[PDB]
Structure formats: structure tokens, C-alpha cells
Amino acid sequence: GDIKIKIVSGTASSFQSGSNIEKSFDGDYSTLYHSSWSNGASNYFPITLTYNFETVTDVDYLIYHPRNNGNNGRFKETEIQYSADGHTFTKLIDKDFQGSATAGKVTFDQTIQAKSFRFIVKSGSGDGQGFASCAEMEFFAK
Ligand SMILES: CC(=O)N[C@H]1[C@@H](O[C@H](C)[C@H](N)C(=O)O)O[C@H](CO)[C@H](O)[C@@H]1O[C@@H]1O[C@H](CO)[C@H](O)[C@H](O)[C@H]1O
Ligand SMILES: [Ca+2]
């Protein structure tokens, strides 16, 4: 069957203390990555999230898992990027997660060779202008 790719590290351009990026790859669907609660700035969005593998890897699809209760931070419009070496990034696709309360699967047209994936989150649901949050982010090869 399908094989889950191991995320070894990541970064977030915005995070609330204790809700940094690595909380969205701890295998726990209740723990959250969550952007900073100070979401008033005009340049608060976009919020840029990066997930790293140990080495360049074949990847066929991903699944974004939003928080399964509460509405703050469910992804809306995003740009998905990836990098073969972890340094230079390439646009994959624009993906609108629609502020959905359930998981969003993105299936790539062809297998990608990526050491890193990157999400430019343009918008997300929630109070005020919104937030960005994620219970778990997953990557798979077929
Ligand atoms: C559980 C809940 O709905 N909390 C929201 C609520 O918080 C009030 C003030 C209080 N702490 C409580 O009822 O528990 O109302 C505020 C808006 O004032 C906010 O929506 C609370 O949600 C939380 O918002 C923060 C960011 O400000 C995070 O997104 C938390 O995950 C979220 O629960
Ligand atoms: Ca988690």
C-alpha cells in the first residue's frame, strides 16, 4: 500500500508559543500547530509553513488535517511549493482548502522529488482576519 514519508523538521513564519510547526507532525490529531494569536497586523498573512524530510524523496500526495474542533486557522487559499534540496523552492499548485472543517487531500499530477514542502497560506478561517492552524500534515508515496 501507500507509504507515509517521515517529516524530521519544519519551520513556521508565525507561531504561538507552544504551538510551533512540529506540533503538526507529532502523530497527534489533537495537538496543533497554530499561528500567533496576535493576528491584527496588515501583513500578518501570508503565513509560510515548511516541512522537511531527511532526504529527497518521491511523494505522490499530501493530506492537510485541520483542527477537529474550533474554527480558528482552517486553511483557505494556499500556494503549495516544494524543494528538491531544501533551499530552492518551486511552485506546485494553488490549493483552496475552503476553510473546510475536514481533511483536505491534494493528489499530485505526477510523482514529485522533494526534500521539503512549503505552504504559503494566503488566508485561513477564524476570528478577525483569521489564523493558520494544523492538527497534522501528512505526505505519502503510492
Ligand atoms: C474554546 C473557545 O471557543 N475559545 C474562544 C473564546 O475564548 C473565550 C474568550 C474563553 N477563553 C473561552 O470561552 O474558552 O472566544 C475567543 C474570542 O474572543 C476565541 O475565539 C477563543 O478561541 C480560541 O482562540 C485562540 C486564538 O485567539 C486559539 O485559536 C484557540 O485555539 C481557540 O480555542
Ligand atoms: Ca499534531
Binding residue per annotation — 135? Answer: yes
Q: Quick one: resolution in A?
A: 1.8
SS3 state at 46 = coil
Question: Would you tell me how many other CB atoms lie within 10 Å of the CB of residue 60?
Answer: 17
Does 136 belong to an annotated binding site?
yes
- Phi-psi category of residue 99: left, alpha or beta, with phi > 0 → left and psi -120 to 50 → alpha: left
Q: Which ligand is nearest to the CA of 134?
A: 2
Measured between alpha carbons, how far is residue 141 from residues 2, 4, 62, 123 in Å? 6, 7, 9, 28
Would you call 112 exposed, middle or buried from its count of C-beta atoms within 10 A (0-12, 13-18, 19+)? buried
Residue 68 has which C-alpha cell?
477537529
Give the whole-angstrom CA distance, residue 47 versus residue 13. Answer: 6
Ligand 1, CB cutoff 6 Å, lining residues: 37, 70, 72, 127, 131
